[PDB]
Amino acid sequence: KDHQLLRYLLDK
Amino acid sequence: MELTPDQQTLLHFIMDSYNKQRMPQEITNKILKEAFSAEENFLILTEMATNHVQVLVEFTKKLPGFQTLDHEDQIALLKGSAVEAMFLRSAEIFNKKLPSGHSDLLEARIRNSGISDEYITPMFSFYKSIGELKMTQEEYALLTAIVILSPDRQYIKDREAVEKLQEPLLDVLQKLCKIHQPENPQHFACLLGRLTELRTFNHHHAEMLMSWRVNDHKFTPLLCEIWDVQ
């Protein structure tokens, strides 16, 4: 949850 | 030796992902066109940096083997390199050739952008050091990949898996340095030595941003994740 936008972009 | 068929493939492929970035002129045109207030510059900086992190994630995902890394490790590498990648790209843009008297004006405008005097000094010292290396587009692309796949990063669980991915790029960069500058068998080590100055921008990035001469410091949510501000 801390780096949720970053994890989202790495997965996508 | 020369670049092997596999090394030319890797280089051209890194070059292609690297070129997806916002063009230098699109950045320097705006700064040179007119002077802006410190508040206007702070918003130009945040929007440029949000775009840059976005493109950097796409660049990173294309790095051979990055996708096969542990997911927590993938995050640690992105978070650990974003500020350095931004300042290396800012150094690449700063040292690009422009008409007579333009670089002087670009440097004056950045200097008066709203950034604190404490930071102007190490920033310009680094940009000029990069300038003295006369790096090629390929060298900036490989250096950026090398910065990203740094195994000596904080919170990396499997360093050797990251080392395995960095080493082949370090080899292409070394061969390139030997060819482009036979006149400096120090070129490879100078380029690697600049990478140590780059890390210093990590410690003071938050303070550099918070000391911008503006009343309010708003960042985008993607920048709060990466920069650890707000």
Ligand SMILES: Cc1ccccc1NC(=O)[C@H](C1CCCCC1)n1c(-c2ccc(Cl)cc2)nc2cc(F)c(F)cc21
């Ligand atoms: C952010 C980003 C991403 C990608 C490419 C370039 C950038 N960089 C920027 O937009 C800012 C702008 C911003 C607007 C004010 C003037 C400096 N910027 C900085 C810089 C200063 C301070 C900090 Cl804290 C960070 C960077 N050094 C620069 C050197 C350059 F030649 C240049 F053209 C722009 C430069």
